[PDB]
């Protein structure tokens, strides 16, 4: 009764039924009063929120971790900055989970490199968390849903989802670690032989990447790039015909590979053009490179992949830049026109790459 606040009307009646449901599962009046509103009081347990708080000093003492590094991790993960180590502010679970990060430093990694990776993860996970919010809201916030409908629906859904997230995360991480190490193996294997690898094949490789701003100079947001990536893939798939291979969509970019450069430069140019004419998209840029590369599990690795990716990064919006390797590999009668973009030093590569801007 005192657990209904200043509420009246539909809202007050909805709250009373929520409190009843909470009280009868064993949540105490004090807990309900301490949590305004108590809508997710039952649901938040499932993600580790027990309504308890901890000081940085207590975490340091109990878990035997460095206090200064703990605070550096706590802040890098996105927790509130607390300058007083004795102040009981942070949620207990947040403090305990930050403590687990010292292990990476005990096993010999620099505290600075650990912190950097945590920052990157935090950025990425903030985008993933937002998509997860929408997904969950669509399922729970049905029309007319009352506070009790929401409390119960969200509790039921979250209880089933939580056991699935751990395994999913590791699986997606591992997928990326495999790709990253396969890229690395092929790198060193190309540089030891100097020349081709076994299985290798002459390919022309292009990445076509959406730029992160509109023509007016606005920022194309992260959730909008998610939706546009799927639209870029549909489009690349429609314009892509043999002998052009549409390999994969990564981020807001598509990867195309071809034995021969002519039909590919052609497909990339067409692709940049229909994006330019569709006002839903920000502009597209593309980088192209030719050479010897090997394929594992349907993907392509090697120098032309490395070069194409870096050349895509330095291309201006609406522009198709190509390494000299691509124009040399063009043989006969073509109708592209070429401007010399100049020699350019690219980040992961050494031998200054000569670039050409390409147009119909």
Annotated binding site: 209, 248, 252, 285, 299
Please, is 308 exposed, middle or buried when counting C-beta atoms within 10 Å of its C-beta (0-12, 13-18, 19+)?
Answer: buried
- Is residue 253 involved in binding Ca ion (CB under 5 A)? yes
- Is residue 358 involved in binding Ca ion (CB under 5 A)? no
The one of Ca ion, its own copies, none whose footprint includes residue 327, by CB under 5 to 8 A per kind, is none
360 forms bridges with which residues in the sheet?
A: none
CA–CA separation, 330 vs 333, rounded Å? 9
- Taking the least distance from each CB to its own copies, the nearer of 209 and 329 is 209
> Which of positions 42-81 make contact with its own copies (CB under 8 A)?
43-44, 47-49, 53, 75-81
Supply the minimum distance, in Å, between the C-beta of residue 332 and its own copies.
Answer: 30
- Is residue 145 involved in binding its own copies (CB under 8 A)? no
Classify residue 283 by its DSSP letter.
P
- Is residue 221 involved in binding its own copies (CB under 8 A)? yes
337: tokens are 């026109």
Rounded to the nearest 5°, which phi and psi values hold at 242?
-50, 145
Q: Which residues contact 5 (CB under 8 A, 6 or more apart)?
A: 15, 36
Q: Are 130 and 223 in contact (CB under 8 A)?
A: yes
Q: Are 322 and 288 in contact (CB under 8 A)?
A: yes
Q: How far is CA 330 from CA 16, 82, 206, 245, 285, in A?
A: 76, 62, 15, 18, 21
> Which of positions 257-316 make contact with Ca ion (CB under 5 A)?
none
- Is residue 241 involved in binding its own copies (CB under 8 A)? no
> Which of positions 92-121 make contact with Ca ion (CB under 5 A)?
none
> Which of positions 104-133 make contact with its own copies (CB under 8 A)?
104, 107-110, 113-133
Among 172-180, 247-255, 289-297, 318-326, which window interacts with Ca ion (CB under 5 A)?
247-255
- Taking the least distance from each CB to Ca ion, the nearer of 221 and 337 is 221
- Is residue 256 involved in binding its own copies (CB under 8 A)? no
Residue from 178, 345, 359, 360 in contact with its own copies (CB under 8 A):
178
By the criterion CB under 5 A, which residues form the site for Ca ion? 209, 212, 251-253
């Amino acid at each position: 009764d005192d657990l209904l606040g200043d509420l009246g009307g539909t809202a007050r009646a909805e709250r009373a039924k929520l409190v009843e449901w909470l009280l009868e599962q064993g949540i105490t009046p004090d807990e309900i009063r301490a949590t305004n509103p108590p809508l997710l009081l039952a649901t938040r347990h499932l993600v580790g929120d027990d309504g308890t708080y901890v000081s940085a000093r207590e975490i340091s003492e109990n878990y035997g971790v460095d206090l200064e590094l703990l605070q550096r991790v706590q802040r890098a993960v996105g927790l509130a900055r607390v300058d007083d180590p004795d102040a009981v502010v942070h949620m207990r679970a947040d403090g305990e989970a930050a403590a687990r990060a010292q292990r990476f430093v005990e096993l010999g990694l620099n505290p600075d490199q650990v912190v950097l990776v945590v920052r990157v993860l935090a950025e990425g996970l903030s985008h993933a968390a937002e998509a997860m919010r929408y997904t969950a809201l669509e399922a729970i916030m049905r029309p007319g849903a009352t506070e009790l409908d929401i409390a119960k629906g969200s509790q039921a859904l979250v209880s089933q989802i939580v056991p699935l997230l751990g395994p999913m995360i590791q699986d997606m991480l591992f997928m990326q670690l495999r790709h990253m190490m396969e890229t690395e193996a092929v790198n060193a294997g190309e540089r030891a032989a100097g020349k081709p690898l076994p299985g290798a094949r002459q390919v022309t490789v292009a990445f076509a990447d959406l730029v992160g701003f509109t023509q007016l100079g606005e920022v194309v947001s992260a959730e909008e790039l998610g939706h546009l990536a799927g639209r870029l893939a549909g489009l690349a798939r429609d314009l892509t015909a043999p002998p052009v291979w549409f390999i994969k969509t990564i981020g807001d970019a598509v990867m195309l590979v071809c034995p021969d450069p002519a039909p590919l430069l052609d497909t990339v140019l067409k692709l940049v053009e229909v994006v330019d004419t569709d006002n839903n998209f920000p502009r597209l840029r593309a980088g192209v490179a030719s050479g010897m590369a090997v394929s594992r599990a349907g993907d392509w690795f090697g120098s032309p992949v490395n070069v194409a990716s870096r050349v895509t990064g330095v291309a201006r919006p609406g522009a198709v830049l190509v390494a000299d390797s691509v124009r040399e590999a063009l043989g006969d009668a073509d109708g592209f026109q070429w401007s010399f973009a100049g020699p350019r030093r690219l980040r992961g590569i050494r031998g200054d790459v000569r670039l050409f801007r390409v147009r119909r």
